Amino acid sequence: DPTLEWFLSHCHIHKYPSKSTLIHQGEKAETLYYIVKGSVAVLIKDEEGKEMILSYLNQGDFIGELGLFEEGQERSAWVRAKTACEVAEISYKKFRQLIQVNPDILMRLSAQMARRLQVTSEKVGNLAFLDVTGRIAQTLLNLAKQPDAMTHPDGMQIKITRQEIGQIVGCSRETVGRILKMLEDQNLISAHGKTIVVYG
Amino acid sequence: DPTLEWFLSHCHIHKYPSKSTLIHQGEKAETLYYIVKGSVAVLIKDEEGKEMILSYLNQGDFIGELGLFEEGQERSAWVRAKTACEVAEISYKKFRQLIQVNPDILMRLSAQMARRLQVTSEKVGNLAFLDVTGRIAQTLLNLAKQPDAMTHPDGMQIKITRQEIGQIVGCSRETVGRILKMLEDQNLISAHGKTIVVYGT
Ligand SMILES: Nc1ncnc2c1ncn2[C@@H]1O[C@@H]2CO[P@](O)(=S)O[C@H]2[C@H]1O
Ligand SMILES: Nc1ncnc2c1ncn2[C@@H]1O[C@@H]2CO[P@](O)(=S)O[C@H]2[C@H]1O
Ligand SMILES: Nc1ncnc2c1ncn2[C@@H]1O[C@@H]2CO[P@](O)(=S)O[C@H]2[C@H]1O
Ligand SMILES: Nc1ncnc2c1ncn2[C@@H]1O[C@@H]2CO[P@](O)(=S)O[C@H]2[C@H]1O
């Protein structure tokens, strides 16, 4: 992809090990990132340090983009590497010059912003309108149709901790365990360790 | 400024009365709108027809923008006029031609998308982390911080109905009215008119 190749030639690229923080909430935003390889989690926290994952992003995703548009703003969320990552970085000032040369690179960025607004709006709906059981069931459904889910005789096999589920749906790890047991009892999933088979 | 003037010269401008739907969820998206005058709400609905307000947008805001980026998408939300609106309309096709001329028009639209994603992300946190009283309290704090809030000797004065708060936080107007009376009793707010004063705001 020539447009992305051109953009990346103007970036400087860096390796982040698994679990490192790319972006800290509250930092002053002056640069844009783009994931060349790997995946990250975007998260927010409450007064007590409970975490809610807003999104996973992966190869091909921009990160740190929301600052490009307002002079001197603070990063709104933490971004943590879930795997080893290779990340390209560019200042906003240089990226604005690229936009002038070829506004297709802004279109690519803005397409991902629009998708993220839709996804996050759906999350608002889920938190407002679904109970925690329905949120968990929708999450397991989603993880099963992810590229990293492994086919199984009876559905798809996924690997996720109860803690990570609770960070997606907004509940404690104890509440996750109780709901997973219920779904097992209903013959809708199987659960063994960090492994869950989602039937159907 | 004259960027906005030039853009509006390529649009068709039309009027929506108060309460009328501009965009329905599920319609095919092929056109972008820009609010010349008025205010709208962006809304989603649950299975029982309960509504939740995702955003209020105003003069200078783009609406219907999210479908510009990928061909053949559905509208993701309803957009309903709060006051009567005058809205400029342009096809996605024509708008993409204007972007080549001056991409500041896409910068302005994307700055608004960026802000909306931050507001909606904060809403995810509030719904995950706060109970209904806490969500009402944060809604009042958010309204007291807005440009359109009025300085008052006890704090900031806002204008918002109980039904409006309920559609924002996800509760009935009667639940809102009970909780505002409670907050008043804790000496945190005044009710009164159509009007709430958020103390220490
Ligand atoms: N709801 C959401 N969905 C996806 N990415 C998000 C998000 N909220 C914030 N981010 C990302 O998290 C980053 C935090 O730094 P920013 O410069 S505000 O840019 C932000 C986006 O890249
Ligand atoms: N309302 C909620 N209650 C409890 N935990 C929550 C929560 N919303 C998000 N979380 C996160 O979900 C996590 C699930 O595992 P924990 O180790 S109990 O830590 C929890 C918090 O970090
Ligand atoms: N969370 C949100 N905040 C603000 N506006 C939103 C929103 N979700 C959707 N919208 C607006 O609602 C519109 C519905 O039609 P679209 O073409 S998907 O464009 C959408 C945006 O203008
Ligand atoms: N959990 C909930 N309970 C009641 N109303 C809710 C709700 N979530 C969203 N709403 C909406 O909030 C509105 C507040 O005013 P109503 O006229 S009672 O109509 C209500 C519903 O449309």
Author numbering:
A (entry chain A): 9 to 208
B (entry chain B): 9 to 209
Paper quotes:
Negative allosteric cooperativity between cAMP binding sites in CAP occurs as a consequence of the protein-ligand contacts formed.
We selected Sp-cAMPS to remove the interaction between ligand and the Arg-82/Ser-83 pair, cIMP to remove the interaction between ligand, and the Thr-127/Ser-128 pair, and 2′-deoxy-cAMP to remove the interaction between ligand and the Gly-71/Glu-72 pair. Fig. 4a shows the x-ray crystal structure of CAP bound to Sp-cAMPS overlaid onto the structure of CAP bound to cAMP and demonstrates no significant difference in structure (root mean square deviation = 0.24 Å over 2177 atoms). We observe no significant conformational rearrangement of the ligand contacting residues, and the only inferred difference is the loss of a hydrogen bond between the phosphorothioate moiety of Sp-cAMPS and the hydroxyl group of Ser-83. The binding affinities of Sp-cAMPS and cIMP for CAP are therefore reduced in comparison to cAMP, as expected. Furthermore, K2/K1 for both analogues is also increased consistent with theoretical predictions. The computed and experimental data therefore demonstrate an unambiguous relationship between ligand interaction strength and allostery.
